[PDB]
Amino acid sequence: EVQLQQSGPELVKPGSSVKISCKGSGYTFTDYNMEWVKQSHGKSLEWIGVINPNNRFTSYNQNFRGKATLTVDKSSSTAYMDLRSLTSEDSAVYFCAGSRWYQYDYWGQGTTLTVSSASTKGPSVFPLAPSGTAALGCLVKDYFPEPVTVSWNSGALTSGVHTFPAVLQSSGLYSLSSVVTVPSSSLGTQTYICNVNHAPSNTKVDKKVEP
């Protein structure tokens, strides 16, 4: 399969630099130029520039000169983009893409970059107690950074489970909830435990949710 595999998510302080990699496999790497694109606010797209793996020729969006530097290593089929002097304006999802004959044929999976001086904060977990079917859940409050994951009954429970995307609050902290729809007749005789994982703070919480 064609794969443009980018390096993983980045969380860095203002003023640092990051280098994003984009490794191509499953196609002739030298038949394509590597375009780079920034998506801000989860919406709008800006073209950063392009590099040709055959000859290292480059073209840039003038807005990114002195911000982004594009390089390439043909032999390892990898393109790179260095982003320097980082500010919160650079927080975004960045994409590499393989182009040929003025056509974007292939896209990387994206690299999320968060520029922030905020410190890690673990979550507080509270039950959403149930009072046909019934809904119960767990509320995961005021953590940073993403992500939190949630399972029920150590993964043994999945039917009727929905774990929501987090919300970003005014405070700059995240909160999310996970809910399960279960038979009312099972309330009081079935154990329901939500398992909340926040790897960035080395925190795990189990909460048994009871009527």
Added chain:
Amino acid sequence: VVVTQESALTTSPGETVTLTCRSSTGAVTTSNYANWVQEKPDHLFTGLIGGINNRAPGVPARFSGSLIADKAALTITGAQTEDEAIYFCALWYSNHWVFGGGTKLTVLGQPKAAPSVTLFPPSSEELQANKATLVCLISDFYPGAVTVAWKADSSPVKAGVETTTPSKQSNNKYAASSYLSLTPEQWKSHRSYSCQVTHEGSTVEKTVAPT
């Protein structure tokens, strides 16, 4: 230079839908090499059209590019439920790409459904932590759009509200969660708080009280 696209379009399976792409410099020409790319959840970009109305590798025949008047166009014939996505166009200007703002394409692949709503009061444990969150669980609705409003007794409250963007359930309907943050004082000092959810087919209000 500004590239402009419809912000949202709605279609149904089997229908034909046409997206357009305008350039602020004047008429789009084949030398703008209009590209169309598709964004699906989890930052998943797929190339669709580029060059001169050329389909990217593996793209279904139902996608085609053309010029319509002074604009570039993407036509999807026989639309499928999977075609729901954000569609971006990009135009070449001699030495750089410029992206449009994207078109959110809805494909109504499901019977419409108004949500089931469950409102959870703050848990006594959270109140003992000197905090209060009301959680409005909005489940099993279609299409993926609702409006949420909160009231303190019979008066609107806007401050301290965060709602998730609708998320797909395993049955392809949508769920969302809204959160109202209060102080313990505020929670105890009203008779009731309500979450009002409006969907095209129904408005439902759920109410919780500190008693």
